[PDB]
Design a protein around this nucleic acid. Structure first.
Ligand SMILES: C[C@H](CCC(=O)NCCC[N+](C)(C)C[C@H](O)CS(=O)(=O)O)[C@H]1CC[C@H]2[C@@H]3[C@H](O)C[C@@H]4C[C@H](O)CC[C@]4(C)[C@H]3C[C@H](O)[C@]12C
Lengths: 476, 50, 100, 49, 50
DNA sequence: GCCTTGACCCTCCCCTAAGGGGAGGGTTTAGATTGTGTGCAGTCTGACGCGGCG
């Protein structure tokens, strides 16, 4: 056994990946058949709940007047043109209505099963079928969460036996007939929850609407949903066997992308995501091999992840493709001319203007490491030569402080009103500068008078008696 | 010379040959005095005792 | 915007532009010393974000702020030589000045 | 002289004012060190009592 | 007698052979594709690795 | 001089009709393909922790 011998996650992955053998042309077909039988079982278990079929026939009468098209409702039929769907929808509606009234109780299990097997014929688009199964999951999980809030409160009270709290709770479904039997033992635990016997009502009386909103029994709903779970675990275990058998295909494709910015296991994992999508989308009834379809999705995922995350500064996919196209045009022009082309002629063989190609050539460059050795030494690196350009020079800070002092000096040599409106008009020793109207309203004076005051104060400061300190803070 | 053999023969004889001149790289030339001008500056490739 | 080789440099007197030709490049044969401008160049800048004190300073003396900053090539300090050669390499699509 | 960023401009202004006194703070590379040890899973901290 | 001189004309040849195998893998990869009857040799030669 | 007043004036931002141009983002793509692929190294010397033998 090779366990504990290597550190490489590539070797560990290849080691655990090679323990699944490749499928034949026949192995892919019956794995795909297992997937489609799992999904068919999920659908025939969905058919027991009626409102999903009601929503689907709502969708069809919306297709009738074209609020939508049935090309988005069904992908085809198995025993898309819109005339056969009329036949199948009519025969399905004639089944749903003939099931709706027949309620009894042994007779009620003939029509539901034949409607299930006649609803099996519709191979829906994934969106509608997923909507139906998620709708049923929400119905069953809210019903289930009040089902276990029934026991949530029973744990809120005291010690919790529910080994035999389930004895006659099954089947009554209308009232507290099962609830009265709990105090019939008169053990202390059977005390507690009973004084909460009123507060429990709106849980199991909210059942009062839902058993009138679903039509079928609590365990009937729960068990068609557990049959849905069995069907989807069959379809999910069969999808896992098709992904696990085809990981060599992903490595086979991913080895051709190995040095474009992403590492080999990164490419393998992105291609594995593409392969899982391919398994979800594959159709074996087209007669093609799984490799033929799956290569498209694996290559899509790998190239998309290279466009997404191979670069520090991310370039969008449209510019990534412009760069790739420019590069292969440059390769052709370098081969056919023996000389690296200039952007002028590189813009004439391409369809693009020259100023567009110049920025495309300036746009595709990867950052240098600041641990790059300069001089190819190991003592001085590129980061040692890069300067903080946001630092204020200490002579500039000292000039700023001297200028604050000088304007403080000249503003002390003005009237208190003029120095105030001139410290307020500008942001001097305030956090914000003000407009003529704000300075005026603070003084309860007009805008134009404040303009006059500040213009006069500026004219005073223009005189060389008050200006020779400040004129030193100017340049050529 | 791209020489194409056909599929099935005990000899594998040629369908055709497409022979032409490809440009693979430029080789830096040594000057009359044993130096190379590389990115404008004269360089010396020191010999190696290995 | 593009940087511009020019003899029209802000905050630099006519004395420091004495040995630059009309293209802003030093003459060949010019005896220069440290700090002398060899090639005059200005970089376009913006958003000067004036401090309130220097904002008042420019309100009193009415001096506009430069939209460009002096980015010239100067002689290194302590170095005093003679300009013996000037080469101008211009890109295709850029217009050659009188010196080029 | 090297890393105290606020203290070195104060020192320049103090030299220009004829006051040869320093107000030294923390070197900036010690703050870089503290932030780089915390970028490991390690809580390094100045006990400010 | 155990230490040997390797000079520019040999080190350059070794690096050229390195570039030649870097292009050889891509030429062997391109020939495995079925585009084989319409391409010239200068379409499968990439001068940039060399 | 202090203070209003009515008339002007500035820049800046958003709007016009009928789309053009482009950036940046999604999606699928069905002959068949099913395990990467590089080096490199002329260090020595302590010193510590551990499988494995006794
Ligand atoms: C900051 C430093 C001054 C010291 C200047 C002067 C020389 C410059 C390097 C060289 O130009 C080579 C190279 C050019 C690439 O374009 C960008 C990376 C390199 C390493 C440059 C980085 C940086 O710009 C250097 C170190």
């Amino acid at each position: 056994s090779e366990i504990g011998r290597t550190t490489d996650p590539v070797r560990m992955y290849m080691r655990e990946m090679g323990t699944v053998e490749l499928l034949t042309r026949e192995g892919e077909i019956d794995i795909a058949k297992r997937i489609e039988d799992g999904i068919n079982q999920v659908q025939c278990s969905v058919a027991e709940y009626p409102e999903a079929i009601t929503y689907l026939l709502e969708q069809y009468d919306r297709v009738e007047a074209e609020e939508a098209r049935l090309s988005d409702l069904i992908t085809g039929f198995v025993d898309i043109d819109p005339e056969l769907a009329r036949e199948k929808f009519a025969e399905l509606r004639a089944q749903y209505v003939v099931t709706r009234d027949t309620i009894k109780h042994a007779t009620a299990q003939e029509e539901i099963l034949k409607l299930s097997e006649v609803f099996k014929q519709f191979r829906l688009v994934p969106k509608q079928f997923d909507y139906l199964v998620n709708s049923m999951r929400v119905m069953m999980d809210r019903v289930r969460t009040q089902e276990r809030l029934i026991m949530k409160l029973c744990v809120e009270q005291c010690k919790m036996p529910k080994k035999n709290f389930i004895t006659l709770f099954t089947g009554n479904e209308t009232s507290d007939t099962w609830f009265n039997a709990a105090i019939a033992m008169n053990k202390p635990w059977s005390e507690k929850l009973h004084d909460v016997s009123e507060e429990v009502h709106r849980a199991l009386q909210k059942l009062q609407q839902i058993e009138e909103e679903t039509g079928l029994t609590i365990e009937q709903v729960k068990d068609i949903n557990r049959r849905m779970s069995i069907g989807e675990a069959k379809a999910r275990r069969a999808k896992k066997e098709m992904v696990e058998a085809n990981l060599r295909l992903v490595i086979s494709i991913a080895k051709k992308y190995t040095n474009r910015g992403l590492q080999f296991l990164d490419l393998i994992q992105e291609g594995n995501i593409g392969l899982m999508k391919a398994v979800d989308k594959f159709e074996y009834r087209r007669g093609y091999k799984f490799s033929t379809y799956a290569t498209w999705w694996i290559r899509q995922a790998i190239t998309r992840s290279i466009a997404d995350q191979a670069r520090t500064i991310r370039i969008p996919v449209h510019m990534i493709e412009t760069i790739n196209k420019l590069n292969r045009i440059s390769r052709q022009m370098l081969q056919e001319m023996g000389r690296e082309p200039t952007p002028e002629e590189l813009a004439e063989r391409m369809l693009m203007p020259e100023d567009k190609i110049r920025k495309v050539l300036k746009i595709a460059k990867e950052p240098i490491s600041m641990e790059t050795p300069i001089g190819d030494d190991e003592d001085s690196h590129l980061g040692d030569f890069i300067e903080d350009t946001t630092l204020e020079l200490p002579l500039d800070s000292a000039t700023t402080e001297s200028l604050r002092a000088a304007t403080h000096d000249v503003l002390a040599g003005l009237t208190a009103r003029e120095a105030k409106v001139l410290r307020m008009r500008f942001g001097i020793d305030m956090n914000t500068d003000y407009t003529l109207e704000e300075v005026g309203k603070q003084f309860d004076v007009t805008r134009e008078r404040i303009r006059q005051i500040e213009a006069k104060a500026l004219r005073k400061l223009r005189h060389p008696s008050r200006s020779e300190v400040l004129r030193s803070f100017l340049d050529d | 010379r791209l020489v194409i053999y056909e599929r099935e023969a005990p000899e594998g004889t040629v369908k055709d040959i497409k022979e032409q001149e490809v440009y693979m790289g430029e080789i830096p030339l040594m000057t009359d005095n044993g130096t190379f001008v590389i990115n404008g500056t004269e360089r010396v490739i020191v010999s190696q005792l290995h | 915007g593009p940087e511009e080789i020019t003899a029209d440099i802000p905050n630099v007197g006519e004395a420091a532009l004495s040995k630059l030709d009309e293209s802003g490049i030093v003459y060949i044969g010019a005896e220069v010393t440290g700090g002398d401008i060899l090639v005059g160049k200005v970089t376009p800048k913006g958003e000067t974000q004036l401090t309130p004190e220097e904002k008042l300073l420019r309100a009193i003396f009415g001096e506009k702020a430069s939209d460009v900053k002096d980015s010239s090539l100067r002689v290194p300090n302590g170095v005093s030589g003679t300009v013996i050669d000037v080469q101008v390499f211009t890109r295709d699509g850029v217009e050659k000045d009188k010196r080029a | 002289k090297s890393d105290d960023v606020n203290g070195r401009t104060k020192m320049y202004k103090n030299i220009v004012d004829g006051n040869h006194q320093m107000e030294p703070g923390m070197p900036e590379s010690f703050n870089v060190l503290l932030k780089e040890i915390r970028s490991l899973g390690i809580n390094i901290e100045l006990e400010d009592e | 007698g155990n230490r040997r001189i390797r000079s520019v004309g040999e080190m350059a040849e070794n690096q050229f052979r390195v570039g030649l195998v870097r292009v050889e893998r891509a030429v062997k990869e391109r020939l495995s594709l079925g585009d084989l009857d319409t391409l010239m040799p200068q379409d499968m030669i990439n001068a940039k690795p060399i």
